[PDB]
Design a protein around this ligand. Structure first.
Ligand SMILES: *[C@@H]1O[C@H](CO[C@@H]2O[C@@H](C)[C@@H](O)[C@@H](O)[C@@H]2O)[C@@H](O[C@@H]2O[C@H](CO)[C@@H](O[C@@H]3O[C@H](CO)[C@@H](O)[C@H](O)[C@@H]3O)[C@H](O)[C@H]2NC(C)=O)[C@H](O)[C@H]1NC(C)=O
Ligand SMILES: C[C@H](CP(=O)(O)[C@H](Cc1ccccc1)NC(=O)[C@H](N)Cc1nnn[nH]1)C(=O)N[C@@H](C)C(N)=O
Ligand SMILES: *[C@@H]1O[C@H](CO[C@@H]2O[C@@H](C)[C@@H](O)[C@@H](O)[C@@H]2O)[C@@H](O)[C@H](O)[C@H]1NC(C)=O
Ligand SMILES: *[C@@H]1O[C@H](CO)[C@@H](O)[C@H](O)[C@H]1NC(C)=O
Ligand SMILES: [Cl-]
Ligand SMILES: [Zn+2]
Length: 605
């Protein structure tokens, strides 16, 4: 460690801790900057050399964390929890947790190489015709093909290509990760990940939310299954069984927006799939990001700085460059450089993703003057919810009209059902998936799911919660959890489930603050500077305060609450229930063992 980055000496008490923290933050930004930079260089240009540079940057970060980590424990270990300054306790508790820096050097090098290689496998995997990338090739197949056999080829090829080679590495990663966090006092890495919500009842609280939400999912599921049965027939769809996992428009069946075509209840009302209008009008990536930005500035939030426009990667490079295409928002921790890296495609769903990523950026801009340790969400679900809340307003038929994407205007019950059904295909269909991913990982980290049961337990949870089944046989050679980005990229998922509940709590409060007085699902906060100020207060707090109290200041309640989501969807919740009854549907999938047959031609599309 460079001498300037090393910790000096400090008194063993709170006034020393504060000087410690200032000295730390001074050196942290440089260490953060070089590792973010090196990750950026790699993820926008996947090369062995850039992987090497990133691993060295990560080793440097580990050196930094050990030095300051061990000094913090030398002076402050048995007194930091009684400090008067609550932000200083948060800062100190963070520095004192070493994580992977608890590993000896050799194992640090093993760990960093495992992360690099798992990331490279996921982001460079291809499906070859007897070759397609995940983004855009396989994604567009999953979204637009209605050929059972073709969808099957893409789904199987992707899961086999990404997952199978990842499994031995994921096993070794899990062991080293657990060894590292066990030395910070956590029983396993999952306990560490859950501690970020600072709630002793986290898992029970989540289960209680899901119980309130599940009936909405079960009714959407049965309604969509019926539509699928009309198109693919009784041989490929079982009306009392799980839905084959490749038929819902998305590689993970986690959002069903792309089959809106087949389920739209009132096709004579305005056509809410405005993707074609975007293409007819010549929308490109940069337009999408400029339209998102202007929503933020309409609220008197900040525009994207010039460094964002000059540095960001907003389209997949066409110059023969391997990149990580999975969207991300980047804080370089120098208070100046903030970027998005998205392989943006011209679709309405991608326009919502653009807002989601820009919501991350806006957070970074508002708290860039906090101590680096407090530059994060009040919890990770907050950070994930910011852009989604704004996109809730953007998605309304009235707002789409304002921005030229929906010429025809209506305000009637059929049009509302259409719109709420389309929104539910994104927000309701996602809830079981957002909930199950880290149930799987928590069981792996705890050891209840050994490698011998990685896929058995994944599909147990996929069937239990999502009511889907794999369309070809799977065994423990397959590692289908590894075919989802966040798993090999070692980044948690429960934040998205929390965000999907939170974002409707946020939406209700912002709409009220803007003075909006109609149905919650027709609120558009565009140009509400009062709504903007209320959101800005949340953004500026970073993690300086407990998320339960930031929440109460914003929405008037100190807990996650499903009621705003339920209120938003109430009309289509009622309607789907009626429709399923009148069709004599079975809610659920009591033929839990059922899987579809293979196409007679298979393999062939
Ligand atoms: C789409 O239409 C709905 C429904 O409009 C209502 O029903 C129609 C059949 C007509 O009879 C309308 O004249 C009637 O208002 C609109 O929702 C409604 O919005 C108004 C405000 O614009 C609400 O009235 C307010 O009620 C609050 C109490 O909550 C009072 O404090 C206010 O002073 C004001 O009178 C009305 O409650 C609301 N209805 C429902 C069921 O929420 C909606 O605005 C419209 N959408 C668009 C985009 O134009
Ligand atoms: C599109 C979105 C990408 P994201 O912005 O959430 C992305 C996922 C990710 C995580 C680690 C490394 C690389 C990427 N997260 C980020 O870019 C940010 N670092 C989020 C952040 N949160 N606090 N500071 N930053 C996403 O993954 N959504 C879920 C629902 C999904 N598509 O499965
Ligand atoms: C696991 O599966 C491997 C892949 O074979 C393909 O998938 C299996 C599940 C069957 O559907 C088979 O018809 C496919 O060819 C097999 O090579 C392997 O032997 C299977 N068993 C084990 C223990 O790995
Ligand atoms: C990609 O990385 C290589 C080093 O691995 C570098 O020489 C090259 O300039 C990079 N390409 C771009 C477009 O940055
Ligand atoms: Cl999380
Ligand atoms: Zn995000």
């Amino acid at each position: 460690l460079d001498p300037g980055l090393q910790p000096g000496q400090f008194s063993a008490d709170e006034a020393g801790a504060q000087l410690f923290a200032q000295s730390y933050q001074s050196s942290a930004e440089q260490v953060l900057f070089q590792s973010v930079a090196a990750s950026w260089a790699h993820d926008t240009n996947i090369t062995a050399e850039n992987a090497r540079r990133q691993e060295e940057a990560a080793l440097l970060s580990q050196e930094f964390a050990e030095a300051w980590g061990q000094k913090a424990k030398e002076l402050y270990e048995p007194i930091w929890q009684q400090f008067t300054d609550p932000q200083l306790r948060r800062i100190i508790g963070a520095v004192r947790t070493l994580g992977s820096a608890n590993l000896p050097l050799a194992k640090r090098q093993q760990y960093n190489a495992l992360l690099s290689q798992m990331s490279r496998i996921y982001s460079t995997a291809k499906v070859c015709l007897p070759c397609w990338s995940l983004d855009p090739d396989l994604t567009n197949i999953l979204a637009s093909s209605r050929s059972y056999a073709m969808l099957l080829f893409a789904w199987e090829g992707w899961h086999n290509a990404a997952g199978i080679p990842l499994k031995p590495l994921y096993e070794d990663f899990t062991a080293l990760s657990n060894e590292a966090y066990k030395q910070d006092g956590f029983t396993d890495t999952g306990a560490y990940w859950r501690s970020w919500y600072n709630s002793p009842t986290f898992e029970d609280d989540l289960e209680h939310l899901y119980q309130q939400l599940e009936p909405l999912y079960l009714n959407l599921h049965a309604f969509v299954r019926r539509a699928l049965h009309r198109r693919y027939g009784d041989r490929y769809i079982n009306l009392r069984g799980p839905i084959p996992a490749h038929l819902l428009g998305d590689m993970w069946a986690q959002t069903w927006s792309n089959i809106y075509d087949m389920v739209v209840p009132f096709p004579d009302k305005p056509n809410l799939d405005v993707t074609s209008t975007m293409l007819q009008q010549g929308w490109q990536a940069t337009h999408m990001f400029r339209v998102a930005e202007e929503f933020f500035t309409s609220l008197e939030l900040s525009p994207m700085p010039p460094e964002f426009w000059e540095g960001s990667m907003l389209e997949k490079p066409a110059d023969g460059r391997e990149v990580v295409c999975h969207a991300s928002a980047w804080d370089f921790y120098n208070r100046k450089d903030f970027r998005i890296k998205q392989c943006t495609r011209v679709t309405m769903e991608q326009l919502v993703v653009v807002h989601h990523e820009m919501g991350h950026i806006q957070y970074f801009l508002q708290y860039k003057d906090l101590p680096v340790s407090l530059r994060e969400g009040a919890n990770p679900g907050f950070h994930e919810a910011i852009g989604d809340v704004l996109a809730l307003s953007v998605s309304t038929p009235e707002h789409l009209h304002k921005i030229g994407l929906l010429d025809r205007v209506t305000n009637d019950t059929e049009s509302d059902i259409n719109y709420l059904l389309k929104m539910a295909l994104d927000k309701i269909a996602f809830l079981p998936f957002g909930y199950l991913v880290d149930q799987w990982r928590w069981g792996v980290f705890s050891g209840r799911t050994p490698p011998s049961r990685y896929n058995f337990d994944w599909w147990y949870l996929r069937t239990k919660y999502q009511g889907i089944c794999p369309p070809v046989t799977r065994n423990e050679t397959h590692f289908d959890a590894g075919a989802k980005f966040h798993v090999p990229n070692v980044t948690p998922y429960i934040r998205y489930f929390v965000s999907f509940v939170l974002q409707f709590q946020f939406h209700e409060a912002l709409c009220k603050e803007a003075g909006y007085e109609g149905p919650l699902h027709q609120c558009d906060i565009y140009r509400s500077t009062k709504a903007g100020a209320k959101l800005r207060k949340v953004l500026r707090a970073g993690s300086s305060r407990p998320w339960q109290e930031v929440l109460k200041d914003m929405v008037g309640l100190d807990a996650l609450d499903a009621q705003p989501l339920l209120k938003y969807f109430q009309l289509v919740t009622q309607w789907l229930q009626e429709q399923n009854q009148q069709n004599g549907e079975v809610l659920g999938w009591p033929e839990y063992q059922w899987h579809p047959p293979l196409p007679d031609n298979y393999p062939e599309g």
